[PDB]
Design an enzyme around this catalytic site. Structure first.
Site, PDB file in Angstrom:
ATOM      1  N   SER A  44       5.190  32.712 -47.586  1.00 31.38           N
ATOM      2  CA  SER A  44       5.896  33.206 -48.765  1.00 31.38           C
ATOM      3  C   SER A  44       7.379  32.962 -48.532  1.00 31.38           C
ATOM      4  CB  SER A  44       5.609  34.686 -49.006  1.00 31.38           C
ATOM      5  OG  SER A  44       6.297  35.158 -50.151  1.00 31.38           O
ATOM      6  N   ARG A  45       7.947  31.988 -49.247  1.00 33.60           N
ATOM      7  CA  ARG A  45       9.340  31.617 -49.015  1.00 33.60           C
ATOM      8  C   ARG A  45      10.278  32.786 -49.283  1.00 33.60           C
ATOM      9  NH1 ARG A  45       6.543  27.261 -49.082  1.00 33.60           N
ATOM     10  NH2 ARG A  45       7.391  25.133 -48.996  1.00 33.60           N
ATOM     11  N   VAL A  46       9.963  33.616 -50.278  1.00 27.68           N
ATOM     12  CA  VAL A  46      10.779  34.803 -50.526  1.00 27.68           C
ATOM     13  C   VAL A  46      10.732  35.722 -49.311  1.00 27.68           C
ATOM     14  CG1 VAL A  46      11.041  36.851 -51.960  1.00 27.68           C
ATOM     15  CG2 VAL A  46      10.512  34.644 -53.019  1.00 27.68           C
TER      16      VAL A  46
END
Lengths: 133, 52, 51, 40, 170, 51, 281, 52, 180
Positions: free
Chosen positions: G141-143
């Site tokens: 999850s890049r966030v």
């Protein structure tokens, strides 16, 4: 332990009952423990004052009480040593059935003190073919 | 060792007095949980009637 | 000594099984190569004939 | 076979060099006291 | 608080307890449900009188509805202010009684343990204590000494002459 | 589409131990004394809608 | 929004865009929303069908070239707007079915290259006992932590580290070799966490309860315990903290952190629970 | 006292397997009569075989 | 094809798979329309096991504990775990051998082979080319047998005693007769 109870006179034990608590250090780690002075004073009803030892500063209990105390200690100790020991000292409990019965009874008594009120049922209005239509 | 064993076993059973005031709370509570049960049963009947 | 003898025997059996697996994987590799070629070529032809 | 060998290799290397790093961390400050911040 | 009474149950008194527990769970699953939304239903006959063309049975149905909701709210406000329950509350009080007696004797046990710890911590060092004073205090090991050293003259001077090593050696 | 309470959805008590019998019986008896009565107060209505 | 198989191809093509249109009302009106496109490959199948029956020329695997512009249009409508445009949101959770685990394909690759994360799901993990069968290595999850509570950060960082170590070491460990205690602890904690992250279907949990359970798992109240017992250690513990410790849950829900007071209270509650209860180890 | 000799590396065929088999046979034969058995070993393979 | 408020259609469709490729578009699309699945395999039929059902590619929606019991659910999931753990060792067994494995892995392999051979049934219509009579099998007997095989109450028996026997009494009788 020994059957040597210190005299509570101030000439021997200064400040015995000046406060409502006693304190002690226990074991090699010296854990603290506080005891009510009434729990302690319970001993001086079994204490026998004819017998005085160790500079006449300690009396002896009666053997019945002293051995009751010893047996309670031994029971706690062997319970600690055993694995099947009871998780509580509150012997055989047998009052869970009555609790279940009274719970079910109150539940039902409410459920059927409701529908005495919720079914007055003055009259109804049924639509019937030929007459009401 | 005896003192430590007795001490820890008494620590184990120190909790055994709250059974009463847990019980005591049973009679005080259930005589309120029922008055707040009859209400919910009434409203259950209302809801079922309306949905029907 | 028995350990070393069993080790040699196990290495022999492992090399044999590896050769068998290499044969099987070679067959599968050639099959997949032909499949890829045919699929790409049919894609190209259908894109050439869809004009 | 691929993930198998890779993960086996990684685990073996991790264990071996964890042991070696433990030994080096034990024997560091003695042979290199100029770095020990305990003595600074 | 009475919901934290689990660990004092025993397997002989398990199923009963579980029954009680599930009963209460049922009750709460009712109550929270039937008090979370509150009143979102509250049907409005202005819509249906228009949307329906018969308007002959709808009227009687609505009459039934408004006749039942009145008696429902009546019973509600009436209960919202005996003997039928005391015959079981007596059972409860008996259980309270016996529970208090169990707690009492267990507290007696733990009090005796605390007294034993107090006595032990307040005792003198036993190697400082005089031997004859200890034996005058103790009435049991008095009988142990008389048995082996007054009723006999040839018993060994060991702490435990009755032990298996001594018996088998004899 | 009327909603009337089904009395039989009520359930009587299950005895567990003898000491409760003096309560349980008074419950179940009174429960019957309410179940049949309620039944009557139902069916009389059901009749007096139909005359 | 049901665009099933009997429903024509244009309806299967338009249903996700209709859903995004319905969600833009929430996104623009200051409210929040979430949209789940289920079987997003059937959309591409329908678009292929339409273009091939409209005589448009195909590409590879018979798809057109407009698949990227087909999914980018759809997924770029998800957004977090500013305080001047209301502050709404529209989250997206597309779903994709691969064949033989081939994520080197064209559609999975396209949709992976235009998303802020991945949640991979495997059959090996699904049948081994891990349900949900989420592979936390490939899944990302890049966030990341910005979308995560501090109270959950504190536990999840340690959890990710421990699970990384366990995943590294377990494959070599399973050969029956004999390892030290610092590695046996890694294996024990990894097994505990792997048995903690299992869940029943349609049985979600609150955030505070997740925090409490992962605290019990991370601080070492499950290492000596048997793995197969954890499945009830969880449940009972949950009931306990829902019965007698509602205040801890309310405090975690409000403050969204773990002060030292809540730390100590939770530790005391776990100790009381382990005292009151007994397990196989 | 049963001294079981074994190796520390793998890929040794099944010699340590046969060793541990004979050791299990001996232990199960001598523990019936009541002989208290102790186990000495050489190599990690016998340990991994007889730990559980 | 769908159950409705009027009646019900149960359906049983046989789906060909060309070139043993389950990634073909036809079966790939057909997989989405089914409520229960049974994927047969040639690798298992070459072992003489019939029905050659692959219990891992096979699946269903009526396996949840809210439909079947929790003992059924747990037995099914334990069997699936066992068979996956056995599949995970196929490479290392083919290359190196069973001797490299530990004892837990050997026990797993034994129980997996036993439950593979136990999940094989001689049908009645196969009597024309098999000879052996048919064996109808109820569900609780299957569940008890699987529970016992997983626990370890049948490790003493051989591996070829589970082949085409139905329940467990037949397996034990065949092991007795094979002891001679």
């Amino acid at each position: 332990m020994l059957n040597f109870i210190p005299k509570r006179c101030p000439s021997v034990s200064l400040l015995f009952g000046k406060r409502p608590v006693q304190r002690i250090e226990v074991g090699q780690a010296r854990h603290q423990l506080e005891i009510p002075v009434e729990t302690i004073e319970k001993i001086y009803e079994g204490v026998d004052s004819r017998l005085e030892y160790h500079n006449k500063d300690y009396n002896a209990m009666k053997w019945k009480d002293f051995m009751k105390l010893k047996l309670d200690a031994y029971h706690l100790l062997e319970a600690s040593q055993s694995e099947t020991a009871a998780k509580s000292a509150l012997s055989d409990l047998n009052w869970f059935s009555d609790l279940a019965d009274i719970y079910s009874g109150q539940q039902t008594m409410a459920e059927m003190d409701v529908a005495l009120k919720a079914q007055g049922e003055q009259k109804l209005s049924y639509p019937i073919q030929g007459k009401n239509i | 060792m005896g003192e430590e064993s007795v001490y820890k076993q008494m620590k184990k059973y120190a909790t055994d007095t709250k059974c009463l005031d847990y019980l005591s709370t049973f009679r005080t509570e259930v005589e309120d949980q029922i008055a707040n049960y009859k209400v919910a049963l009434v409203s259950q009947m209302r809801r079922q009637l309306t949905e029907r | 000594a028995s350990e070393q003898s069993a080790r040699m025997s196990a290495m022999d059996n492992a090399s044999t099984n590896a050769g068998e697996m290499i044969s099987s994987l070679t067959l599968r590799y050639n099959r997949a190569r032909q499949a890829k070629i045919t699929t790409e070529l049919v894609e190209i032809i259908s894109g050439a004939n869809a004009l | 076979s691929v993930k198998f060998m890779d993960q086996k290799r990684s685990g073996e290397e991790t264990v071996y060099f964890k042991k070696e790093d433990e030994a080096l961390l034990r024997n560091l400050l003695a042979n290199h006291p100029e770095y020990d911040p305990k003595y600074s | 608080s009475w919901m934290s009474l689990a660990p004092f149950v025993a397997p002989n008194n398990a199923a009963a307890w579980r029954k009680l527990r599930d009963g209460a769970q049922e009750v709460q699953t009712v109550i929270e449900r039937q008090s979370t939304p509150g009143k979102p239903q509250q049907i409005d006959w202005a819509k249906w009188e228009s949307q329906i063309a018969h308007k002959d049975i709808l009227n009687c149905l609505k009459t039934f509805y408004t006749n039942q909701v009145q008696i429902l709210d009546r019973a509600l406000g009436a209960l919202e202010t005996c003997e039928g329950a005391e015959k079981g509350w007596a059972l409860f009080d008996a259980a309270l009684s016996a529970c208090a007696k169990s707690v009492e004797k267990s507290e007696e046990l733990l009090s005796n343990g605390a007294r034993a710890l107090w006595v032990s911590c307040s005792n003198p060092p036993v190697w400082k204590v005089n031997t004859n004073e200890w034996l005058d205090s103790d009435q049991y090991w008095q009988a142990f000494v008389e048995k082996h050293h007054f009723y006999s003259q040839y018993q060994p001077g060991v702490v435990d002459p009755e032990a298996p090593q001594e018996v088998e050696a004899f | 589409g009327f909603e009337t309470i089904h009395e039989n959805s009520i359930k009587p008590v299950a005895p567990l131990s003898e000491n409760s019998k003096g309560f349980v019986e008074f419950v179940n008896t009174q429960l019957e004394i309410t179940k049949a009565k309620l039944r009557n107060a139902r069916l009389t209505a059901f009749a007096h809608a139909f005359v | 929004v049901a665009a099933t198989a009997s429903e024509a191809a244009p309806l299967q093509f338009l249903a996700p865009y209709s859903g995004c249109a319905m969600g833009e009302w929430f996104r623009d009106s200051g409210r929040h929303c979430v949209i789940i496109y289920d079987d997003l490959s059937k959309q591409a199948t329908a678009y292929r069908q339409m273009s091939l029956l409209l005589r448009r020329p195909p590409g590879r695997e018979a798809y057109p070239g407009d698949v990227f512009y087909l999914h980018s249009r759809l997924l770029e409508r998800a957004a977090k707007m500013g305080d001047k445009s209301g502050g709404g949101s529209l989250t997206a959770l597309p779903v994709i079915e691969t064949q033989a685990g081939d994520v080197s394909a064209y559609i999975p690759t396209n949709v992976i290259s235009i998303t802020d994360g991945q949640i991979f799901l495997e059959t090996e993990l699904f049948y081994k006992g891990i349900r949900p069968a989420i592979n936390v290595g490939l899944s990302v999850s890049r966030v990341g932590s910005a979308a995560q509570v501090k109270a959950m950060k504190q536990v999840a960082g340690t959890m990710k580290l421990e699970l990384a170590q366990y995943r590294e070491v377990a494959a070599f460990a399973q050969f029956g070799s004999d390892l030290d205690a610092s590695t046996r602890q890694l294996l024990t904690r990894g097994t505990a966490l792997t048995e903690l992250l299992k869940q029943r279907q349609y049985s979600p949990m609150k955030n505070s309860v997740q925090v409490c359970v992962l605290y019990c798992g991370v601080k070492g109240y499950l290492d000596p315990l048997d793995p197969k017992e954890i499945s009830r250690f969880e449940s009972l513990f949950i009931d306990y903290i829902n019965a007698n410790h509602q205040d801890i849950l309310k405090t975690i829900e409000t403050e969204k952190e773990l002060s030292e007071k809540t730390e100590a209270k939770l530790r005391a509650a776990v100790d009381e629970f382990v005292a009151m209860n007994e397990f196989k180890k | 006292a049963v001294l079981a000799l074994s190796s520390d590396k793998g890929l040794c065929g099944g010699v340590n397997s046969f060793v541990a088999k004979q050791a299990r046979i001996v232990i199960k034969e001598n523990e019936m009569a009541g002989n208290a058995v102790q186990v000495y070993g050489v190599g990690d393979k016998i340990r991994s075989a007889l730990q559980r | 094809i769908t159950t409705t408020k009027k009646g019900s259609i149960t359906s049983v469709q046989a789906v060909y798979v060309p070139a043993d490729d389950l990634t073909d578009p036809a079966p790939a699309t057909t997989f989405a329309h089914l409520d229960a699945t049974t994927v047969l395999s040639r690798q298992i039929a070459e072992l003489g096991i019939y029905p050659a059902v692959d219990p891992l590619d096979s699946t269903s929606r009526m396996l949840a504990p809210e439909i079947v019991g929790q003992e059924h659910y747990d037995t099914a999931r334990a069997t699936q775990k066992l068979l996956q753990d056995y599949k995970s060792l196929q490479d290392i067994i083919a290359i190196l051998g069973m001797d490299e494995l530990s004892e837990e892995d050997k026990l797993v392999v034994s129980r997996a082979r036993k439950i593979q051979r136990f999940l094989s049934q001689p049908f009645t219509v196969a009597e024309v080319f098999t000879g052996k009579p048919g064996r109808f099998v109820e569900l609780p007997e299957t569940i008890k047998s699987a529970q016992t095989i997983l626990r370890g109450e049948c490790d003493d028996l051989p591996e070829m005693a589970f082949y085409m026997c139905g329940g467990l009494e037949e397996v034990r009788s065949k092991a007795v007769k094979m002891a001679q």
